[PDB]
Amino acid sequence: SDYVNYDIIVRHYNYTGKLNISALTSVVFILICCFIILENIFVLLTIWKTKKFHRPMYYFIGNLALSDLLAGVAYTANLLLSGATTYKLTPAQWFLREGSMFVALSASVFSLLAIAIERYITMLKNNFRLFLLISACWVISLILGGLPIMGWNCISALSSCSTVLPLYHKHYILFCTTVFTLLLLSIVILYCRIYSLVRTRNIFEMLRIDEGLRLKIYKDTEGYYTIGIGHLLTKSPSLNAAKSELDKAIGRNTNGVITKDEAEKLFNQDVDAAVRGILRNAKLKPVYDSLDAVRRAALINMVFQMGETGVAGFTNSLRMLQQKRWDEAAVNLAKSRWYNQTPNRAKRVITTFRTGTWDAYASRSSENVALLKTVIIVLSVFIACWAPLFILLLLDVGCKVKTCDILFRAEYFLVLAVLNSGTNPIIYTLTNKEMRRAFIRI
Ligand SMILES: CCCCCCc1cccc(NC(=O)[C@H](N)CCP(=O)(O)O)c1
Numbered sequence: 001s002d003y004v005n006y007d008i009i010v011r012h013y014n015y016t017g018k019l020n021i022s023a024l025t026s027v028v029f030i031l032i033c034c035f036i037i038l039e040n041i042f043v044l045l046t047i048w049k050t051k052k053f054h055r056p057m058y059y060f061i062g063n064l065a066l067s068d069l070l071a072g073v074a075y076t077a078n079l080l081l082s083g084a085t086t087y088k089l090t091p092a093q094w095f096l097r098e099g100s101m102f103v104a105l106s107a108s109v110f111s112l113l114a115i116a117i118e119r120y121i122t123m124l125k126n127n128f129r130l131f132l133l134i135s136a137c138w139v140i141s142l143i144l145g146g147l148p149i150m151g152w153n154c155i156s157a158l159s160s161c162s163t164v165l166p167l168y169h170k171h172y173i174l175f176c177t178t179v180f181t182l183l184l185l186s187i188v189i190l191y192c193r194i195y196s197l198v199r200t201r202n203i204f205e206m207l208r209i210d211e212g213l214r215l216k217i218y219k220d221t222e223g224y225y226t227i228g229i230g231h232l233l234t235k236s237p238s239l240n241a242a243k244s245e246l247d248k249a250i251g252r253n254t255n256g257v258i259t260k261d262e263a264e265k266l267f268n269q270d271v272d273a274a275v276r277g278i279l280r281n282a283k284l285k286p287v288y289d290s291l292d293a294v295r296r297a298a299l300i301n302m303v304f305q306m307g308e309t310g311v312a313g314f315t316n317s318l319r320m321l322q323q324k325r326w327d328e329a330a331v332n333l334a335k336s337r338w339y340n341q342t343p344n345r346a347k348r349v350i351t352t353f354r355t356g357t358w359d360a361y362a363s364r365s366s367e368n369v370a371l372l373k374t375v376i377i378v379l380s381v382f383i384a385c386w387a388p389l390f391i392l393l394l395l396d397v398g399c400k401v402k403t404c405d406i407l408f409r410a411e412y413f414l415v416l417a418v419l420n421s422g423t424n425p426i427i428y429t430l431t432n433k434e435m436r437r438a439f440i441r442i
């Protein structure tokens with residue numbers, strides 16, 4: 001008879017040992033999955049109902065919700081076709097009962113990839129090609145999840161059958177575990193790169209306004225010759241004396257004309273010197289250690305104009321920054337000589353000490369900053385729900401039948417990965433209130 005008969009299921013659930021060992025709890029999860037259906041319906045309903053959410057990143061966030069929406073479906077069917085009903089299924093129906101979970105996982109992982117790569121392009125800066133990436137994602141998912149249905153299983157190799165999945169081959173689970181963890185590794189390494197490089201990029205754009213970029217040697221309001229983002233070359237009133245310093249600070253004979261990178265690489269040096277000038281002063285270091293990344297960079301901007309002693313000459317305001325009473329600090333500095341010399345320059349710096357956000361230099365630099373935080377947490381919860389399963393799966397690959405006993409009760413791990421599908425809609429309305437105000441708007 002066809003190797004699509006009900007005896008193979010009995011035979012394979014016999015060799016593992018979950019045939020005689022069999023146990024109300026289901027109808028509870030069946031109902032919990034219906035909550036995961038709605039939770040992700042509103043995610044796909046609000047992104048379709050909000051004009052500001054018709055942005056490329058939100059389409060990948062929605063595809064992720066569609067993956068976790070079909071996961072909630074595929075698992076309601078799993079609960080209805082598990083336990084006693086497992087044996088009223090053909091091997092094909094079985095590979096279709098579990099294959100739908102792997103397709104829902106594969107799609108979810110590449111959705112996180114598509115969201116992580118749609119972050120790296122915000123700093124380093126296209127609508128049809130997106131519903132081409134989303135189409136590619138599900139085709140690649142069906143191919144990986146369908147491999148056991150297409151033959152890569154163990155229907156004759158009982159010795160090679162997985163304990164947690166009796167018809168799946170240990171080589172298939174070893175492959176999936178490896179591919180998806182390598183992708184999840186690459187995504188973690190990508191967000192850290194995006195987080196730290198934007199931390200530098202924000203400082204590069206802040207002073208690109210307050211000091212102003214230049215490729216040809218100019219003179220400041222005081223008189224002395226300057227280049228790029230406020231880099232003083234010499235106090236000397238000779239242009240060739242300034243060209244001497246520039247052709248030595250860059251190396252090549254620039255003749256006063258430098259490059260975009262040569263300006264940026266010369267800029268970081270004045271950032272390094274400004275940062276070191278804070279880490280060598282007892283009135284600046286505690287202030288810097290107490291400030292957040294936005295206000296840490298805001299202090300570096302004041303030091304990039306006056307200096308160590310120049311910014312130290314504001315102790316009455318620095319003390320207020322240590323006590324976290326930004327409001328009084330913003331007033332004292334507005335009344336001091338610094339807010340009068342360069343008024344619009346200080347105005348932006350003081351607004352950053354008051355707010356604590358870049359909503360003084362660039363419009364979309366708070367909402368994008370809030371998304372980066374939330375978007376990473378979505379991955380942080382994902383990698384925390386699947387890692388216990390992926391480890392047990394990786395144990396089973398190296399386990400012999402009826403040897404490892406933790407495998408015979410893997411359901412604790414399996415449902416953690418299922419409940420992960422309902423954590424993402426909740427994580428949006430809590431951490432990113434930009435999204436939360438659009439949901440409550442329905
Ligand atoms: C490395 C790839 C991992 C994909 C995990 C697929 C998955 C996730 C969550 C649940 C399930 N399916 C189950 O829990 C099944 N009911 C297996 C239990 P049984 O077949 O009854 O022994 C399958």
Ligand SMILES: *[C@@H]1O[C@H](CO)[C@@H](O)[C@H](O)[C@H]1NC(C)=O
Binds near residue numbers: 011014015
């Ligand atoms: C399969 O179960 C039957 C009894 O239901 C028995 O003949 C046999 O011990 C089991 N198979 C293996 C491979 O242990």
